[PDB]
Design an enzyme around this catalytic site. Structure first.
Site, PDB file in Angstrom:
ATOM      1  N   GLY A  17     -13.678 -12.241  -5.686  1.00  0.00           N
ATOM      2  CA  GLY A  17     -12.662 -13.038  -5.020  1.00  0.00           C
ATOM      3  C   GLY A  17     -11.541 -12.202  -4.455  1.00  0.00           C
ATOM      4  O   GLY A  17     -11.650 -10.973  -4.376  1.00  0.00           O
ATOM      5  N   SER A  18     -10.456 -12.867  -4.041  1.00  0.00           N
ATOM      6  CA  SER A  18      -9.351 -12.162  -3.408  1.00  0.00           C
ATOM      7  C   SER A  18      -7.939 -12.696  -3.763  1.00  0.00           C
ATOM      8  O   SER A  18      -7.750 -13.465  -4.719  1.00  0.00           O
ATOM      9  CB  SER A  18      -9.575 -12.110  -1.894  1.00  0.00           C
ATOM     10  N   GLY A  19      -6.973 -12.198  -2.992  1.00  0.00           N
ATOM     11  CA  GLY A  19      -5.547 -12.499  -3.015  1.00  0.00           C
ATOM     12  C   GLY A  19      -4.946 -11.852  -1.785  1.00  0.00           C
ATOM     13  O   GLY A  19      -5.685 -11.405  -0.894  1.00  0.00           O
ATOM     14  N   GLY A  20      -3.621 -11.792  -1.729  1.00  0.00           N
ATOM     15  CA  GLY A  20      -2.946 -11.163  -0.598  1.00  0.00           C
ATOM     16  C   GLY A  20      -3.107  -9.662  -0.688  1.00  0.00           C
ATOM     17  O   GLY A  20      -3.851  -9.046   0.086  1.00  0.00           O
ATOM     18  N   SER A  21      -2.456  -9.097  -1.711  1.00  0.00           N
ATOM     19  CA  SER A  21      -2.457  -7.688  -2.087  1.00  0.00           C
ATOM     20  C   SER A  21      -3.563  -7.413  -3.131  1.00  0.00           C
ATOM     21  O   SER A  21      -3.864  -6.249  -3.410  1.00  0.00           O
ATOM     22  CB  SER A  21      -1.099  -7.332  -2.686  1.00  0.00           C
ATOM     23  N   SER A  22      -4.156  -8.489  -3.707  1.00  0.00           N
ATOM     24  CA  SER A  22      -5.176  -8.384  -4.744  1.00  0.00           C
ATOM     25  C   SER A  22      -6.626  -8.637  -4.324  1.00  0.00           C
ATOM     26  O   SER A  22      -6.900  -9.427  -3.426  1.00  0.00           O
ATOM     27  CB  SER A  22      -4.809  -9.244  -5.947  1.00  0.00           C
ATOM     28  N   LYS A  23      -7.549  -7.956  -5.004  1.00  0.00           N
ATOM     29  CA  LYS A  23      -8.991  -8.078  -4.840  1.00  0.00           C
ATOM     30  C   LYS A  23      -9.594  -8.087  -6.265  1.00  0.00           C
ATOM     31  O   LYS A  23      -9.120  -7.352  -7.136  1.00  0.00           O
ATOM     32  CB  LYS A  23      -9.537  -6.915  -3.983  1.00  0.00           C
ATOM     33  N   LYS A  38      -9.511  -6.712 -11.657  1.00  0.00           N
ATOM     34  CA  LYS A  38      -8.561  -7.206 -10.695  1.00  0.00           C
ATOM     35  C   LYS A  38      -7.754  -5.995 -10.222  1.00  0.00           C
ATOM     36  O   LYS A  38      -7.162  -5.274 -11.033  1.00  0.00           O
ATOM     37  CB  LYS A  38      -7.665  -8.282 -11.311  1.00  0.00           C
ATOM     38  N   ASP A 132       1.427 -25.125 -12.045  1.00  0.00           N
ATOM     39  CA  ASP A 132       0.522 -25.169 -10.900  1.00  0.00           C
ATOM     40  C   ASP A 132      -0.942 -25.202 -11.334  1.00  0.00           C
ATOM     41  O   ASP A 132      -1.758 -24.407 -10.858  1.00  0.00           O
ATOM     42  CB  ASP A 132       0.846 -24.083  -9.864  1.00  0.00           C
TER      43      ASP A 132
END
Ligand SMILES: c1ccc2c(c1)[nH]c1cncnc12
Length: 254
Positions: A17-23, A38, A132
């Site tokens: 998966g992903s994120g902005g600055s994260s993979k 991560k 959240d």
């Protein structure tokens, strides 16, 4: 490919998966065991962002000892440029499982509900309110749901379907109760309570509106209907607590 977290070497399998600055990656260690790494890039991260990250790591590292319904953090490497976290690998996240799966087994659902109450209860006992909660925050690991994160660290994503009325009005453990009820409501009815409202402004208005009756169609499980009705009470003061949910017939009775 390949990568180093502390002394240990990890062979990359795929990108989970992903994120902005994260993979996030699926990896194998030297002993040929499977993990998730991560990766977080700190290059364009502010002090407040850095601190939100350091806080969520410290909390995850701590709360691991308290419950098995919290994801395992095996090791980490933190520098000024990056973060590497060696965690337990899941089978699938709850959202992707629910979206893919047709109908859910009443036993599977009861079992998943139980795990969700246990993970959230733990965070609450340490002063954490997630605020959240969504199916995307849970991970199926050998028929067991695990909480992925605590909501502390900055930045499905952006969804208002699980948002409690008090969060829209602007936050106590009761906020997480609402969000959990939305998750169980989806597992029961195949949709979140306000999913039929397209317009976000109209959807936010419905959630807060007490004259807007949430429909609870009759299912064979009367105990399950009551939980939903209890969780989805607009006034946080009138809403059931997590310690009260763990003593409910839905969780306790055969
Ligand atoms: C952290 C650790 C493990 C996972 C993750 C984030 N997302 C995932 C999605 N699917 C499987 N495993 C994982």
């Amino acid at each position: 490919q390949s990568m180093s977290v502390k002394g240990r070497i990890y062979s990359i399998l795929k990108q989970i998966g992903s994120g902005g600055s994260s993979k996030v990656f699926q990896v194998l260690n030297e002993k040929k065991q499977i993990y998730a790494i991560k990766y977080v890039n700190l290059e364009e991260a502010d002090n407040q962002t850095l601190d939100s990250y350091r806080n969520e790591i410290a909390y995850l590292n701590k709360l691991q000892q308290h419950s098995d319904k919290i994801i395992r953090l095996y090791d980490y490497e933190i520098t000024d440029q990056y973060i590497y976290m060696v965690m337990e690998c899941g089978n699938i996240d709850l959202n992707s499982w629910l979206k893919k799966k047709k109908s859910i087994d009443p036993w599977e659902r009861k079992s998943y509900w139980k795990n969700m109450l246990e993970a959230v209860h733990t965070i609450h006992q340490h002063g954490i309110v997630h605020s959240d909660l969504k199916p995307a925050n849970f991970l199926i690991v050998d028929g067991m749901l695990k909480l992925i994160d605590f909501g502390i660290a900055n930045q499905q994503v952006g969804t208002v379907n699980y948002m409690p009325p008090e969060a829209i009005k602007d936050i106590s453990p009761k906020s997480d109760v609402w969000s959990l009820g939305c998750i169980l409501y989806y597992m029961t009815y195949g949709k979140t309570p306000f999913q039929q409202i397209i317009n976000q402004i109209s959807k936010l208005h419905a959630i807060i509106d007490p004259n807007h009756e949430i429909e609870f169609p009759d299912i064979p499980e009367k105990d399950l209907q009551d939980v939903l009705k209890c969780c989805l009470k607009r006034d946080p003061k009138q809403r059931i607590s997590i310690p009260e949910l763990l003593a409910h017939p839905y969780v306790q009775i055969q």
